[PDB]
Structure 1
């Protein structure tokens, strides 16, 4: 198991990715552009309510 040089090579590039992930490394503008795109899509699909605490209802009796 200590022999599959590709195995340990992938694990090593993994460890490097782990340490370097202070901010999404090699993100490029596509990272932010996408993140924004699907965040906006999800926000639109879900709702526009006070996305922080519980909005209040204040119903009306019959």
Structure 2
């Protein structure tokens, strides 16, 4: 019970932070950036809302055009 209440108090202390971890970490941002770059490379580059729309023509149009037609 004593350890539980102590840890609850420290969790509330963590919640007292305005934002982010108390220890931001010199390498936490670098690791997050590396992971984000890896995810972007794996999943491919994507814009916020880009929705391209290009339609091709009929491919390999087969016809009856021949000398014996």
Q: Does the C-alpha gap of structure 1 residues 54 and 20 become closer, same or farther in structure 2, counting only changes over 3 Å?
A: same
2:35 corresponds to 1:38: yes
Offset from partner CA, 1:13-32 (integer Å, 9 cap, x none): 00010121513221221111
Q: Which has the higher helix share?
A: 1
Q: Does the C-alpha gap of structure 1 residues 58 and 18 become closer, same or farther in structure 2, counting only changes over 3 Å?
A: farther
Count of aligned residue pairs for this structure pair:
58
What is the alpha-carbon distance in structure 1 between the residues aligned to residue 19 and residue 9 of structure 2?
17
The higher relative CO (CA closer than 8 Å, separation ≥ 6) is in: 2
Moved more, 47-56 or 11-20: 47-56
TM-score by length of 2: 0.66
